[PDB]
Amino acid sequence: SLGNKLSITDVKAIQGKKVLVRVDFNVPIENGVIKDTNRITATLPTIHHLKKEGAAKIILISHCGRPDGTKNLKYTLKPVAETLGTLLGEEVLFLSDCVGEEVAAQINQAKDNSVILLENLRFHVEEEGKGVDAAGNKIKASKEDMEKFQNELTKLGDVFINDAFGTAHRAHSSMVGIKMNVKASGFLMKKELEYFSKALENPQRPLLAILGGAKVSDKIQLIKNLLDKVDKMIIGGGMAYTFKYVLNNMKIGDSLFDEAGSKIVNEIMEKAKAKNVEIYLPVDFKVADKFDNNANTKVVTDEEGIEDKWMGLDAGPKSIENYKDVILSSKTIIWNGPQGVFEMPNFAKGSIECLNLVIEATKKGAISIVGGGDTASLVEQQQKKNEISHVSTGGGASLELLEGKELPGVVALSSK
């Protein structure tokens, strides 16, 4: 289950505790400079709550870069400690390792109620379980080595807060091995679990999935899992041309065609029938004579098809009108994919109108969840993040969850 996990706001005994917090600090760093601080700013609510409630120590563990299980100072977390300190208005102590007797002594020496950041977990092969040494030979951590590292992390504190939803799809030591009595979500993880639970567990219906993107093949697992849950599904973007060809023998010209994925289209449509899900594919298209925003364009229906040497790049006007009754009648919406080549303004109208309708439904009480990737980029570029119920920042963990896979870091949390 997703919605019954203990969260930071449920924890009663904090004053005087040593609190270990797993955070997501995987930010790009260029010769000691951090170019995007969004993920660091995102941790401030969890840190402030622990400070105000009187924690004796706030001990942060995280990873960045690609050390592959050896100490590689190109990927040191040191610059993150400086940036976090500037955002907090106080000094953050940075320690050169994350386990052992010297780390413990340095933690105990630190000022009461202060914040401490430990060095990159992935310097240790035991975090991921596998790695590659400096000479380039594969190394593997034994079951006993893993247990020892997890025990050493567990000795660091008294209460565990996991605020790193974006790593929770991994069976890594900091996700599954910190064996404290209280294991609770931080504010970011709490919100991810709250909204994915609302979408997948007991959704207010009708439940609609909006899917899109370039290809069929990478979306097969996502589509098949969502067909077990939803009432309706829009399928759009470049992947739609493969459906129209297989199902109706529609002429597609030079539009994108997914040969490997085409072989699974009939299985998808057959599962939609068996689960009583209504499918909404486009019935017209904006086509172009060149893969370019400046191309000559026109509109063709699915009865006309697309002539040789032209390519479809957005949903057409009738397809866009068909969005209205589908989206506005839905009370939960899961959106994973633009409906055309939204990076080219002349091929963005389908995606922008989809966004406007999702916002309208949300204002009238629907719950809207955006999965990530290009859809999140569209929302950000239109400056509409505050108009969607939840834009996930979980990356690969969000996709695995929507595919129906188990998240080890979520399973390991305490129950409410």
Contact 21, 58 (CB under 8 A): yes
The answer to whether 371 and 398 have CB atoms below 8 angstroms apart is: yes
Alpha helices in 116-186 (DSSP H): 125-128, 143-154, 173-176
State yes or no: 65 annotated in a binding site.
Answer: yes
Residue 396 known to be catalytic: yes
Number of residues engaging Br ion in binding (CB under 5 A): 2
Task: Kindly name the residue from 3, 18, 78, 373 that is annotated as catalytic.
Answer: 373
Between 234 and 366, CB nearer to K ion: 234
- The C-alpha R_g of the chain, in whole angstroms, comes to 24
186 annotated active-site: no
Q: Long-range CB contacts (< 8 A, 24+ apart) of 261-267?
A: 261/215, 261/216, 261/217, 261/220, 262/216, 264/216, 264/217, 264/220, 265/216
The residue from 297, 301, 362, 389 that contacts Br ion (CB under 5 A) is 297
φ, ψ at 160 (rounded to 5°): -115, 130
The structure tokens listed for 266 are 């009939």
Residues 18, 51, 71, 215: which is the catalytic one? 215
End-to-end CA distance of the chain: 11
Q: Of 152-160, 223-231, 269-277, 343-351, which segment contacts K ion by CB under 5 A? A: 269-277
With CB under 5 to 8 Å by kind, the binding choice for 356 among K ion, Br ion, none is none
Least Å distance between CB 318 and Br ion?
Answer: 13
CA distances from 63 to 28, 104, 139, 218, 274 (A): 12, 19, 19, 27, 44
> 205 a known binding residue?
no
How far is residue 357's CA from residue 323's CA, in Å, rounded to a whole number? 8
Q: Of 32-40, 43-51, 275-283, 354-362, which segment contacts K ion by CB under 5 A? A: 275-283
39 is in an annotated binding site: yes
Clarify whether 71 is annotated catalytic.
no
To the query of whether residue 215 is one of the catalytic residues in this protein, the response is yes
Least distance CB 250 / Br ion (angstroms): 19
276 binds K ion (CB under 5 A): yes
The verdict on whether residue 192 carries a ligand-binding annotation is: no
Minimum CB distance to K ion, residue 231 (Å):
11
Could you say which of Br ion, K ion, none residue 276 binds, taking C-beta under 5 to 8 angstroms by partner kind? K ion
Comparing CB distances to K ion, the nearer of 276 and 386 is 276
Site residues, K ion (CB under 5 A): 276
Site residues, Br ion (CB under 5 A): 297-298
Q: Binding-site residues for ATP, please?
A: 219, 343, 372-375
